[PDB]
Amino acid sequence: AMVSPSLIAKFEKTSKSNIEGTIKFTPANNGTVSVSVDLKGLPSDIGPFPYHVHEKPVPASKNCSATENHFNPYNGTVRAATPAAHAVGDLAGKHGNIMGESYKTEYDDSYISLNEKSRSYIGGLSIVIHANNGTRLNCANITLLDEGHGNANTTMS
Template identity: 55%
Template sequence: MMFQVKNICLASLLATFVIGSAPVKTNSPTDVKYVATFENKIDGTIKFSSPNGSVLVNVNLSGLPPSGGPFPYHIHLLPVPADGNCTGAGGHLNPYNGSEAAAALADKEAGDLSGKHGRITGQSFTTSYIEQYISLNETDLAFIGNLSVVVHFSNSSRLACANITKVTTSIGSIERSRTLLTANGGEINTSGSTVFSAAAAATLGFLI
């Protein structure tokens, strides 16, 4: 019985650290960027960067339907499955048990971007803002990497979704998918990261 009481007390204590207002996040690294790229049903990107430790969100979307808005959008807990079914993205990112109905921004769900910054209006939409309650720090409870963004109709049904992926760049390597022509007309596919030395580049007839 004593063991059960101790477990209940411990669970209650831990809950006090998880339930409540979300803390302001200033721990995002400034050298990383993430992007959700929409290519099905709507077009465009939602980009996440951190110029000073807080997360800057840039929204640039087009091809939205002429009716069914204004459109809410949220960060969801799971990546979009391979079949593209947005239902598989799960619920909203909500590590502090916030509420969509809360008045204070800190008390809302961390992933409820439109609840804090306004819904998408019109068939094309652009905005940018600082979002204080999500993070690009992989150790943070509100880390958004490898999750997804879902755009909804105003009736809450899911319109479109996209995975939040890390934008990778590296000096001295090629990290883009394209085809390079060799000197003899052959092809080298550089999907992923391929490092070339200057001598190798000269042999192939191109410069990095």
């Protein structure tokens, strides 16, 4: 039986933002994906910080505007009364905004997919972290977590 590969988004500190850390996505139990957030350097007083999967990659320029709109294949809404009514990539709307100067949390999401054949696939997309007023503060591409794959391989970074 096939299992889809884990993913990661690596945020780096630059003159544009002190936010740095990672969001890891790993297959979990009962058709869910475990999301592990580990971030520091957040500008707390302009949060709390929504964060979402966006539609386009972060380009080499690191312009978070270039990630364009939210990943929302099923046309969910920004506000809702049950998790499934939010966009697939609306992680903060379903699970909580990032908050504080540092934020470390783990949770399962039952909508994002690691499977490239799924309409809910998030590989190759991006994550944007926003100030509370919507300004995009930092962003990262969603890439493979492990260097080595296949049923005859090990991984050894």
